[PDB]
Every structure is written in structure tokens, then in C-alpha cells.
Amino acid sequence: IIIATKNGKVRGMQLTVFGGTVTAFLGIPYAQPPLGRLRFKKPQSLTKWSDIWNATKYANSCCQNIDQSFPGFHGSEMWNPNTDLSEDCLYLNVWIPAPKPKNATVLIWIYGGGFQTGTSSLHVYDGKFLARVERVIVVSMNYRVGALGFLALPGNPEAPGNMGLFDQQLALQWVQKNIAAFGGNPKSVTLFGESAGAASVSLHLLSPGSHSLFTRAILQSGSFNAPWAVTSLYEARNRTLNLAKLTGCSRENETEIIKCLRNKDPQEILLNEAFVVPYGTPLSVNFGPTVDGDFLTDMPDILLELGQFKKTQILVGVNKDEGTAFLVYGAPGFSKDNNSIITRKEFQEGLKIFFPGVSEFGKESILFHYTDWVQRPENYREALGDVVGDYNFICPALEFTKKFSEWGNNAFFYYFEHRSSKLPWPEWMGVMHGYEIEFVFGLPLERRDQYTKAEEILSRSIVKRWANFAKYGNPQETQNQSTSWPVFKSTEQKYLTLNTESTRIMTKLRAQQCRFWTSFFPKV
């Protein structure tokens, strides 16, 4: 199977899926490899080739540091890159139903990883099931991460910032220009992503350059208003200069700094990324999105508040235990290998780990709000997880959804509370950050892979709801006497719970906690 694109022919491969066939094109280039003089610059447009490009295997993942905290452990290692690392990493993947569809809706995945890690080739992002079951087309792309993708010297096109976001945008443009050739509808494209990928999705809603490039958006566990998601101009400058110093590239002509950094091997840059800040936390994002005056024209909180974004439908949600994953990467008393019953004192030391630059009054106020118990030994353990999850993910997602819906668009919010039966992390960590993803991509539909019957059922319905949102803008499951998903409005704030047992309509998720984080805490 061979498809003619604008820049040349590509050959794909046939896959067998559920007694049917899916056609996969893995590793199509969408930009000039950003090497040599091109490192740190916006992605440059592609050449044009005369032969047939073999797209029959995942391409290189972008350069990045790897998680080495738990060698041999599937829980952490499943997120590590499964393909060679290289600066030559600007490639995308396409899954298509067989027989070739005529005008199929397109789903474009953007992975998360704190803007420092990630790759589109992970097992949990395999689009072949969505293509097989719902007959949509699935696209995913690799984008630059870390300093290589987000190094900023505002105004300087040698390193203007936001390069990884421009990588994403160029791929959306590739779909606009080429997807009809694959049987897709360029007028029916839904972006979806998780964590930093969801933050990216929300930023595409704000970038005027992305507005004509997609129809609707889905945000899983992330939004730009999260405290880790956008780096200030002040922080970005101090970090760029710190990087230059650590690598011996401190100069006076800022452009000369960039030249010096271009002569360093990727490993020396990667090695020094962790130290551009005096203290980090498990949620540190040293090189992330900035206000560059190009992709992002002003502080995004201002744009959101004043209604300056694409007017369309959104689907947003979070998991029950967003915060727990991070506790075992530094908080004292914690371990994936015991029940982590911590003391008041340990909770206090824990806040210092996650809020290192915050005043003593600020840390006390967190403790006051989360430690009025009604006693129970796991009180402090659970409080710290909730602190981390509410501050970093849930409260920002809820505030994003309210502000967005106030300008008249339909929004739908979910609360995912099912813990995978195959979860390799201990049960005290609950419904973890990142563990709805395999349900969305329909992994439990494969009966050969250890999931329960109830989980097959949950994933099937989730897959249908996501597909109906992309196609029709309304995430219902209309056939099997399902609970109707009500629109989220700023007054009533209805949301839908996703679980194996009882799907329910609820109101005002974490009302009391979020009043603390959203209204008060930004003042300390």
C-alpha cells in the first residue's frame, strides 16, 4: 500500500487487529532534521523526494533524560523511550482503517512528559485499536523536548523559545495538507493529549497560528494554567544563562552564546539541564513554553480571562489520584515498596520538597487546609498526595474549564476513578497520573492481555465517547442505556465519573480544596 503525499510517496504496512486489518505508516518525516545550524531554531519546511519512503517502523525519539529511579520496574520503565534517541527526530505516525475510509474524522495525539521527556512510539499510545474499532484516523508526532525544544532568548530567532510547540504545529499543518490523500477529513480534526500534551493542546487553543489547523480539543490531566506549564521570561533568561555557564558558553553577544551551545554534543546539554535552577522538585519543568511573542502573544492567563481563544467544544478531565506518583521521587518516608505511613513531621518535610521557594506562612497554610482531620494512620500520607494532585492538576483543570465555558461553548468534564488491575505500582497510590491513557487507546479491548471483563467494558465505552466527541462534538454513548454526559456550566459544574461499577453525575468537584488553591494561594 503506497500513498502519494505532497513531498513524495510513502509505503505503509498491514496490521491484523481483531479479525480485521489496519494500515500503519510509522515514521513519516514532517520537517528538516534540526541539526547543526538548525539546532534551537523553529522547524524548517521539508524538501521533496522522488523515490518511495518506507514508513514501516517507529522513528528515533527526541533527545531526553531518562527515568533511572527504578531500574527493572515496569511502572517507571514503560514511560521511557522505546526507540533510539537522536536530534533527528521530527517524524509522525498515521493509522488508517482498512478498507481505506472516504472522509474519516482525524484524532491527533500529543504526548506528555513535563516538556522534558516523551515519545509517540510508546505501547500505550498505539493508535491501531482506535482505527480498527471506531474507523477514525489516528496521527501522532515526535516534538523536541528539554532545552533542545524550549531554550529561550526572547526575540532572537537563533533560539526564540517554544520550538517544540512549533514542531507540533508543523505536524498539524502536515495533516491539513496531506490527510485527504489517506482518506481523512482535514475539516474534522480533534487534538488530544495528556499532562504536558494536554497543556500543549490548551495552548494551541490560544495560538492564532493553530486556529485553522484543528476543529475540537480533548485535555487529559493538564492545562496551561497549571503551575508547572509556562515558564516566565525572567526564569527563562536566568536558566539559559545558567546553562551557558555550566557548559562554558557564557559570552556577551547572546547570539554567540547560541553558537557555542550548537557545538556541544547533545549529552552535555542534557547533563546540565537539571542544574539551571537552585532547587528542583519532582515536578520541575526547567525548559518549557514561554511568552515568545510568536506562538504565544501575551500571558495566557490574560488571554483565557479575556476570552481570546478558539471558540469550539472541549472535553476535559482528571484522575482520582494525580498526585501520588510524584511522592516516591523525593518525599521522605515514601516508598513504592511499603505502605508509606508518614508522620506529621514527614508531611512537613514533604511540603518543603514540593514548595521549596514558598514562605513559611505559605507552607503552614497548606497544612492548615489539608490536616483538619475528623486518628487514622494514613491521614498524612493521603493528605500529601492530594496536596500535590490538587495544586498541580485538578484545580487548574477545573479553573480552565470554567473560564473557557463562560464564553458560550459546550464543555464536558470527567473524573476518572478506576485503578487498573494490571497496575504494577502499590494500591496506596490509587488511580495514578497517566493511567487512564491505556483505556482511551483501547488496550483492554484485547482479550489476550490480562484485563478483566469489566475493564474491557469500560474502555469500549470510553473509546466510543471520545470518538463521538471528535466526530460530533458530544461525548455520549447513545446505544447501551448509558448515563448521559451533561454539559459543564460555570454555575452548576456537573461532571461525569468514569469507573467499572457506577457512572454518576456529580457537582462541584473538590470545591473547598480548589477555593484554597485558586483564590488564596496565588497571593503568598
Ligand SMILES: *[C@@H]1O[C@H](CO[C@H]2O[C@@H](C)[C@@H](O)[C@@H](O)[C@@H]2O)[C@@H](O[C@@H]2O[C@H](CO)[C@@H](O)[C@H](O)[C@H]2NC(C)=O)[C@H](O)[C@H]1NC(C)=O
Ligand atoms: C538565577 O541564577 C543564579 C545562578 O546560580 C547558580 O546555580 C547553579 C545551580 C547553576 O545553575 C549555576 O550555573 C548558577 O550560576 C542563582 O544563584 C544562586 O541562588 C541560590 C539561592 O538564592 C544561592 O544559594 C546560590 O549561591 C546561587 N548560586 C551560585 C552558587 O552562584 C539564582 O538563584 C537564580 N535565580 C532564580 C532562582 O530565579
Ligand SMILES: *[C@@H]1O[C@H](CO[C@H]2O[C@@H](C)[C@@H](O)[C@@H](O)[C@@H]2O)[C@@H](O[C@@H]2O[C@H](CO)[C@@H](O)[C@H](O)[C@H]2NC(C)=O)[C@H](O)[C@H]1NC(C)=O
Ligand atoms: C518504607 O520505606 C521507606 C524507605 O526506606 C528505604 O530504605 C530501606 C529502609 C529499604 O529497606 C526500603 O524499605 C526503602 O527503599 C522508609 O522510610 C525512610 O526512608 C528514608 C529515606 O531517606 C530513610 O532516611 C529512613 O531511614 C527510612 N526509614 C527507616 C525505617 O529507616 C519507611 O520507614 C518505610 N515505611 C514503612 C515500613 O511503612
Ligand SMILES: Nc1c2c(nc3ccccc13)CCCC2
Ligand atoms: N514518566 C511518567 C509519566 C506519566 N506518569 C508516570 C507515573 C509514574 C511514574 C512515571 C510517570 C504520565 C505522563 C507521561 C510521563
Ligand SMILES: *[C@@H]1O[C@H](CO)[C@@H](O)[C@H](O)[C@H]1NC(C)=O
Ligand atoms: C522499502 O521496503 C521494501 C520492503 O519490501 C523494500 O523492497 C525497499 O527496497 C525498501 N526501500 C528502502 C529500504 O530504501
Ligand SMILES: *[C@@H]1O[C@H](CO)[C@@H](O)[C@H](O)[C@H]1NC(C)=O
Ligand atoms: C468531506 O467533508 C467535507 C466537509 O467537511 C466536504 O466538503 C468534502 O468534500 C468531503 N470529502 C470527501 C471526499 O468526501
Ligand SMILES: *[C@@H]1O[C@H](CO)[C@@H](O)[C@H](O)[C@H]1NC(C)=O
Ligand atoms: C553578535 O554576533 C552576530 C554574529 O556574528 C552578529 O550578527 C550580530 O550583529 C552581533 N550582535 C551584537 C549585539 O553585537
Ligand SMILES: *[C@@H]1O[C@H](CO)[C@@H](O)[C@H](O)[C@H]1NC(C)=O
Ligand atoms: C453495547 O453493548 C453491547 C452488548 O449488548 C456490546 O457488545 C457493545 O460493545 C456495546 N457498545 C458500546 C459502544 O459500548
Ligand SMILES: O=CN1CCC[C@H]1C(=O)O
Ligand atoms: O512527567 C513529568 N512531569 C513534570 C510536570 C508534569 C509532569 C508530566 O507527567 O507531564
Ligand SMILES: [Cl-]
Ligand atoms: Cl475522591
Ligand SMILES: [Cl-]
Ligand atoms: Cl452507564
